[PDB]
């Protein structure tokens, strides 16, 4: 039917119109404190008002942190822009690991652009260039202007064309009766298709055959589009969407990651500040999310402490599973979660507790529903014993290979016999562990 | 009805002509 | 074709009930580990869940690759099995989440549906017209069967595709619409007046009749890593044959994502998941396993199998040893199968079969010596002999393998354990880890 | 006889229906409840909206990248279109550091300083280095001694256009490679050859996996021309802008001539064709879907994009194989026009609310569009179904055949706790 | 313009000062630290009289006092026209440049040439166009009728300017900008006609207009290098440019200043964790200040008698001696409780959020006894706890439930001591199980 | 004619582009022949079409040595490869040389 994927049981934070976390609901069980903590956080991103505010989630491994990480990402909608990313990612053999952060954190602010579009349209009904007097010159071109028509509904116009443009009409490979569509904003033209005011049934090139558009040929037209920074940086550093010959060879060449400098963003923010005063624009900003931060090094983390500082900055959320550790690229310096002390100053941290049997138990309940699976009241007592003596997660994958050995005996119900079948096939860490430690040869 | 087929323009161009006992090849 | 190390080895050998046979598809033993890898079997065949993490550990010489090839074999046509080892991350133009993050997306197929439209019959006049410096090209085609006849309009494609395996007005061809591909089958006018410039002895086939144009449906099963790089940039489709794909941007991943989910819901394509198996797991580093524990977690996971043959070692990035060499998130949440070593008639019977395989033929006594230094030595080496006792054999001109035969072949190859012995008797001879060498034999 | 329809939704209706839930900040329970009961209902009435068609909230158009531009716009026997493409984004650049760093003048020593290292420091010059000319002649095997100093100072791309394969002499130090001669034999090669097939793996490979009917997935965001620079009060500095932008040896390349102009030109003038301009070096795309970034609204998406039309264009067939007369019904207007306008693209014969005697006397008509005596009625459909008994009872009492309604209702939304 | 929504610094609008360089005790956003607030305005006007070149400036002290305040305060009161680029001690360490050439572009970014110009520019209202054309177009004549609000003209054009006048459709009403020199015009907008909207233009309609630019080095290093143009500047790839363009560039600058058409603006380079560079770093730092063409060096560090990179030893600062031998060094010092209560209520002022006396009283004892920052952080984040239960201004209960959410350094620590088996130590041994 | 080619070379002519008109190749055939990571889609599709036009009666193939020597200098990452890249169909002989005795490998240091 559907697909789930140790997630997607898990609707949002769960939370009153008071703030007070109920205690199952949202497909959240327990976590009540970070549940609240992180709806608080919530409340701060969508009052859309301060800049460069960091938390970190600290807990043990399986307790809920990359869960209370989606549900973040689902209170705050579609609409506001979510970037999750792995510590690993960061380092990049195209660029230096400080300008891939700082993507990241230009990638995580959106903007609602309301834009004006002019479109001339409609099926072609001539096309005739005019030569130029000497082509062989050295200088200038060997056409001098394309007369177009253009026929639409209740509608006929007659286009004269430069050069430039009608090299895009024929790299579209256009044709006496095509319907066509020109946007005068960048010159790019799309060849919709072959009208159908002729026969159909003679082609051999899989054609789509589409109606005389509406309206006059002549367009003014509202286009909302949802964009962000990052997309303006790269799309002005790597320039194409011109016909001049830069652009138009800029999509040809290889994409390469480069450095983009600070006068370049420099430059986009005036412009997205000159659009937001004229009433087009609207800045929507979002949530980075780094899990494992641990991977990061001590560079990385010098430079969070001054990307926070920024005024364009976002909430930042990173995670982590690290006791009283040393610091990757130092040798002697030893910090709570593996964050530097410095970085630490400047975050607030949110605790998040282990379990109990009952917890766990439902826990199962909710993965065995959303799984479509059905498990006997013994069954489900054996398994949440096994969850408490080897770890949750191994009680959870457990499940589907029980599913598996429940349908090969033609069976739907889960039973304990299943259970223990399962347990002998598949072994958890601990045994594991126990027969490597008791083995001949580095078994 | 039946619909008109697509007008067919080739002004300018050479020529291919493929038949059962004669091709020819028209140039300029 | 050539004969490989798991050449013999054609499925699980498993029951309707997933209970295994003794002897059956080439895999003799190894009970739980089969009856597990079924029960993995059935998980990939179901397509309901995504991101499992599966761990074959045992010592040496077991059968962890033997069950990977089994899952593979039992695995079926169309279904992606991704086979990679530990050390292809390490590139020096892709990162190693970007090399990851490309061999998950290489195990998930999309079955995409088309409806095409094939023509065949007899080329009855065709007309080109070209430009004069050739770039531009229409033209028209006049093709007919036995009842019908209809005059079509040809593009710069058609044109190409009719000019190379050139038709000559008379001969039959079939075209496909959807895959762009003319196809000749043959000639049936026999033109009198024909100026051989070339030596065609072409087919005589016959007319067909009925139809022209016929629909069909067709079935393809595309990556979506291919898709990823057909969408990546302008020449995309070369990038997937030359490797030149460096680091994918992210907003490529989302829209190829979106669009997938899409062509889903209009029934045009499906999602079929399949097997990545990562074998020597213990060759990654650490920010490897990092990523790969928060890449189980995605929809578009595939089933991750690792095959580690490592005790408690050391943690390839970090100072600290672990069990299996991975660290204890990973070990988390992965489910673990622990392969055993074998008896004297399961080493008889893989040397019977492997012998079976090569064409080669034992006697008894032979299949007692092989079976009596396959338990003292080593199995990989008593199955290794066996061509080389098959070419001394051959040697003396009968064909059938003796005691004589791979006695010489145990006396002229070497095992490992007499090679240790012969070395540490002669540490002189060899160089040292020190550099030290004496070369003179006095 | 009373049969409900369930279907799951959309991505995009998913999409907005989230939007909308996050929109008002966590009080569904009270828009279930007043909702469920009948300010707030301009609050229900967006997700109803939602719930019925996509459309209604946002309707969709083209989807094209955004355009980074700032170019000649109307403010509203021909008309003229002219390129005017620029960027917002301008670098401003004082006239002195053009003309003494850039331009010739009396005070400076560009020209000069470029002759000196151009011309007479060249090593490939033959008026002073005859003997490296000639051995690198015997060395290549170019037919010219002045080839390397022509090679030498021209630059990559006009090197690459002009590029003409001409005779080398035999007698020299330059071979062919395998890989070359392997290339050279398959050039116009037909099938069923052996070599061809072995080195025609990737054309292969392109018809095999259906490759030119398949669709663009990934289109661009944002799309920028290059950042104009500015110097005011000059006119050179915009004739040397022009010409490096519109460069007219690699536009005329990227590009391809007419055809009745090539005609013109070769016979009307007389022309040669090998001094024609070099044209069509653009690179093809894989499909014609690949050429643009510019997708136009299909009526295949429209129908799927609403899980109630697509079950409603499901049922339709069912019943007009069985040749029944179907009711129609609806809350709003704007519902009424879509499906008017759905209907006149499938070309189904409907008529929309002197017209109740037309619809009993002509059976040919199929599907009547009504809102909240037709005796001729066989199935009554409830698009936006109510379960008030007051307005159900009179609408099934204007409904000798078999009478079956049908209830179009959606999986996980406020209908399906109505 | 200039977007932006609430940072750290944003309350601190430059050094509190008065005619006699003298710290004010609030002033500007500034509070406390009255030396270094001297010494700071003392290096503002070095930096302003612009006389000495090449001269750097340590500022050292305990983490969480004034630093990146006092480097905000220089940058705000030297204002704009004046180069200022702030540069992090790990932006250097780059895939495509050196070490040495990334601290060059650094060093020459903020050094700036001073240019005046002059161009005449028409600007006015469009009141009629007439244009007239052949059969074939071949040639066109035209007349513009342009006025301002006290005068009308009307102009006879040529071919190309009605070519200019085409492309771009201008129609009557629109105010329109021409260059004649460059053939260059920008619609300004529309007029007040409604039947984006801008003024018409007031006075003469030809106007000459003194345009003020100001060039750094580095761009006309990166446009007289031919290797590649003007977009290097913004898409970053400028790839080790030779150093015999540099003097010429220098000596270029040196001759257009001996003229009189040009004349050196210098600024101020501030590098931030000064100490995450290399020994080859400093090196080049030592040499690279002893320039004419070289800027003010203001280095910030926490970090005391730690390892130097690259080295293997430890020095004060971070730094090696050689390099603090070069330097003169400000010292920022702990805060005490009133100045504490002073940044808060300046941060709370700036973020619009209303306290109450107990409240602040609250914020500033915790404050005192873990950190200004997270007193700062929590006086954002009580705000919404406060909106949570409908009032305006936040009370004690806000801040202890802000408290007792959000942790702080100790009892983090405290709680990961408390309970070790359950996270994961540097010899990766953890216990996720709760039993056994 | 018998013309006798290895597999890399069928592998190296297959994975560039053909003889073309595009800017891209003759921008690239001026330019440092740069080697590149060949997939191993390339590789199945050559060894499919070999093997088709070898059951066929037309080719031949003829498997061949490699041989490597002092593999004590080869790292243990490209020892793991030979262990994956033995286990192939299309695979030749390989012989390898050494003239160490107990030696730690190189890119271990316990071993
Ligand atoms: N409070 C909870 N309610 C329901 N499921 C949970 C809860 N906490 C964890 N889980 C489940 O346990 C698994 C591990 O949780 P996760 O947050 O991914 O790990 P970690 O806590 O280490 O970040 C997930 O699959 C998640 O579905
Ligand atoms: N149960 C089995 N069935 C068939 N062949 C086997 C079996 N066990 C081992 N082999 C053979 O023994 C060899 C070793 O297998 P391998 O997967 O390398 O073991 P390991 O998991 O210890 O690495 C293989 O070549 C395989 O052909
Ligand atoms: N004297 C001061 N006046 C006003 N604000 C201050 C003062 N000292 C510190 N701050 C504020 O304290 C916060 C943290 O101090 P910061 O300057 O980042 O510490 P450091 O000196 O370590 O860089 C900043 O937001 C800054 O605005």
């Known amino acids: 039917v559907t697909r789930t994927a140790a997630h997607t049981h898990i609707k949002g934070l769960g939370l009153d119109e008071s703030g007070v976390a109920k205690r199952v609901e949202g497909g959240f069980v327990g976590q009540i404190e970070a549940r609240e903590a992180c709806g608080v956080i919530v409340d701060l991103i969508k009052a859309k008002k301060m800049s460069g505010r960091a938390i970190l989630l600290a807990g043990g491994p399986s307790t809920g942190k990359t869960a209370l990480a989606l549900a973040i990402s689902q209170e705050l909608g579609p609409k506001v822009p979510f970037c999750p990313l792995v510590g690993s990612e960061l380092y990049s053999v195209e660029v230096k690991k400080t300008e891939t952060l700082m993507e990241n954190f230009r990638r995580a602010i959106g903007l609602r652009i309301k834009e004006t579009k002019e479109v001339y349209e409609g099926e072609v009904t001539e096309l005739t260039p005019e030569d130029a007097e000497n082509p062989l010159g050295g200088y200038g071109k060997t056409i001098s202007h394309v007369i177009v028509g253009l026929k639409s509904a209740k509608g006929t116009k007659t286009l004269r064309l430069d050069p430039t443009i009608y090299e895009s009409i024929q790299r579209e490979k256009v044709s006496i009766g095509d319907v066509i569509y020109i946007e005068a904003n960048t010159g790019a033209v799309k060849r919709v298709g072959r009208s159908d005011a002729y026969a159909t049934e003679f082609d051999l090139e899989t054609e789509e055959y589409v109606p005389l558009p509406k309206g006059e040929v002549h367009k003014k037209k509202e286009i909302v589009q949802d964009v962000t920074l990052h997309d303006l940086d790269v799309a002005n550093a790597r320039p194409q969407g011109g016909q001049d010959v830069i652009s138009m060879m800029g999509q040809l060449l290889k994409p390469k990651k480069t450095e983009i400098t600070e006068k370049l963003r420099q430059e986009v923010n005036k412009v997205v500040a000159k659009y937001i005063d004229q009433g087009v624009a609207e800045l929507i900003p979002g949530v980075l999310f780094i899990d494992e931060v641990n991977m990061l090094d001590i560079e990385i983390f010098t430079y969070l402490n001054k990307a926070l500082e920024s005024n364009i900055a976002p909430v930042v959320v990173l995670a982590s599973n690290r006791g009283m550790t040393t610091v990757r690229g130092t040798e002697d310096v030893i910090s709570p979660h593996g964050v530097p002390p410095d970085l630490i100053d400047r975050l607030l941290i949110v605790r998040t507790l282990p379990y109990d049997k009952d917890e766990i138990r439902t826990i199962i309940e909710r993965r065995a529903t959303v799984e479509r699976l059905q498990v006997e009241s013994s069954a489900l007592d054996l398994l949440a014993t096994m969850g408490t003596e080897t770890s949750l997660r191994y009680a959870l994958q457990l499940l589907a290979p029980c599913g598996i050995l429940a349908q090969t005996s033609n069976r739907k119900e889960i039973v304990v016999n299943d259970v223990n079948e399962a347990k002998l096939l598949f072994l958890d860490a601990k045994r594991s562990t126990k027969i490597l430690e008791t083995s001949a040869n580095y078994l | 009805f039946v619909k008109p087929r697509r007008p067919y323009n080739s002004e300018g161009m050479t020529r291919i002509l493929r038949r059962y006992e004669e091709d020819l090849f028209c140039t300029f | 074709s050539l004969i490989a190390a798991h050449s013999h080895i054609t499925g699980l050998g498993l029951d309707e009930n997933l209970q295994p046979r003794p002897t059956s598809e080439g895999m003799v033993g190894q009970l739980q580990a089969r009856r597990a890898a079924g029960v993995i079997l059935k998980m990939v065949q179901n397509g309901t869940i995504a991101g499992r993490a599966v761990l074959v550990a045992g010592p040496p010489s077991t059968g962890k690759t033997a069950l990977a090839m089994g899952v593979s074999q039992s695995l079926g046509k169309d279904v992606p099995f991704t086979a990679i080892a530990g050390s292809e991350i390490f590139s020096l133009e892709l990162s190693k989440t970007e090399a990851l993050t490309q061999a998950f997306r290489k195990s998930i197929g999309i079955k995409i549906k088309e409806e095409t439209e094939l023509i065949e019959g007899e080329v009855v006049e065709i007309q080109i017209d070209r430009s004069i410096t050739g770039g531009h090209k229409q033209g028209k085609l006049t093709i007919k069967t036995t009842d019908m006849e209809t005059i079509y309009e040809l593009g710069n494609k058609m044109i190409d595709g009719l000019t190379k395996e050139k038709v000559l007005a008379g001969d039959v061809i079939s075209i496909d619409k959807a895959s762009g591909k003319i196809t000749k089958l043959g000639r049936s006018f026999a033109r009198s007046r024909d100026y051989d410039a070339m030596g065609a002895d072409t087919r005589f086939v016959q007319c067909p009749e009925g139809e022209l144009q016929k629909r069909k449906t067709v079935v393809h099963t595309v990556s979506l890593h291919e898709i990823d790089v057909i969408n990546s940039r302008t020449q995309g489709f070369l990038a997937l044959f030359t490797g030149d794909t460096g680091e994918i941007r992210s907003e490529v991943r989302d829209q190829i994502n979106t669009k997938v989910a899409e062509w889903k819901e209009e029934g045009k394509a499906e999602i079929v998941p399949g097997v990545l198996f990562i074998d020597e797991v213990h060759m990654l580093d650490i920010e490897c396993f990092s990523f790969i524990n928060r890449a189980l977690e995605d929809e578009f996971a595939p089933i991750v199998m690792m095959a580690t043959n490592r005790g408690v070692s050391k943690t390839r990035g970090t100072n600290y040893k672990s069990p299996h060499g991975l660290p204890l998130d990973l070990l988390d949440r992965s489910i673990i199968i622990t392969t055993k070593s074998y008896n004297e008639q399961e080493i008889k019977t893989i040397l019977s079969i492997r012998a079976q395989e090569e064409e080669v033929e034992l006697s008894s006594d032979a299949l007692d010596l092989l079976t009596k230094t396959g338990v003292e030595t080593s199995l990989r080496y008593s199955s290794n002999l066996i061509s080389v006792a098959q070419q001394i054999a051959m040697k003396r001109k009968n064909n059938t393998v003796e005691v004589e035969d791979v006695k010489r072949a145990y006396l002229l190859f070497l095992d490992s354990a007499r090679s240790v012995k012969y070395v540490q008797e002669n540490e002189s001879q060899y160089i040292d880890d020190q550099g030290n060498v004496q070369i003179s034999i006095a | ?418």
Request: proline share 5%; glycine share 2%; net charge negative.
């Open chain 4, 1 to 418: 006889i009373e049969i409900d329809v369930l279907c799951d939704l959309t991505q995009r209706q998913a999409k907005l229906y989230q939007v909308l839930k996050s929109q008002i900040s966590t009080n569904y329970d009270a828009i279930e409840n007043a909702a469920t009961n009948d300010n707030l209902i301009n609050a229900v009435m967006q997700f109803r909206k939602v719930c019925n068609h996509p459309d209604l909230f946002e309707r969709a158009d083209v989807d094209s990248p955004f355009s980074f531009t700032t170019f000649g716009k109307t403010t509203s026997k021909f008309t003229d279109l002219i390129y005017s493409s620029r960027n917002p984004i301008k670098y401003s650049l004082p006239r002195l550091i053009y003309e003494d760093l850039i331009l010739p003048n009396y005070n400076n020593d560009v020209d000069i300083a470029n002759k000196l290292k151009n011309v007479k420091f060249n090593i490939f010059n033959p008026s002073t280095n005859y003997e490296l000319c000639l051995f690198l002649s015997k060395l290549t095997g170019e037919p010219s001694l002045n080839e390397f100093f022509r090679v030498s100072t021209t630059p990559l791309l006009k090197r690459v256009i002009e590029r003409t394969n001409g005779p080398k002499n035999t007698d020299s130090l330059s071979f062919k490679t395998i890989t070359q001669e392997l290339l050279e034999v398959t050039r116009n090669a037909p099938s069923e050859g052996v070599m061809a097939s072995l080195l025609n793996v990737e054309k292969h490979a392109y018809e095999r996996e259906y490759l030119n009917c398949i669709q663009r997935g990934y289109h661009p965001n944002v799309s920028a021309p290059p950042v104009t620079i500015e110097v005011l009060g000059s006119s050179h500095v915009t004739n040397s802008i022009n010409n490096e932008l519109f460069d007219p040896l690699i536009s005329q390349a990227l590009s391809d001539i007419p055809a009745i102009t090539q005609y013109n030109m070769h016979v009307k003038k007389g022309i040669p064709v090998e001094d024609f301009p070099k044209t069509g070096l653009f690179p093809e795309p894989l499909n014609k879907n690949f050429s643009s970034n510019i997708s136009m609204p299909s009526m295949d998406r429209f129908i799927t994009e609403s899980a109630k039309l697509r079950k409603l264009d499901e049922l339709l067939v069912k019943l007009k194989s069985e040749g029944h007369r179907v009711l129609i019904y609806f809350q709003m207007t704007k519902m009424m026009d879509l499906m008017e306008e759905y209907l006149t693209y499938r070309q189904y014969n409907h008529i929309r609310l002197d017209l109740v005697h037309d619809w009993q006397t002509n059976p040919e008509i199929f599907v009547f569009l009504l809102s909240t005596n037709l005796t001729a009625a066989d199935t009554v459909i409830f698009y936006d179904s109510d379960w008030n008994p007051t307005i159900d009872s009179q609408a099934m009492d204007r409904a000798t055949r078999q009478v079956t309604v049908y209830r179009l209702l959606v999986r996980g939304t406020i209908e399906e706790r109505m």
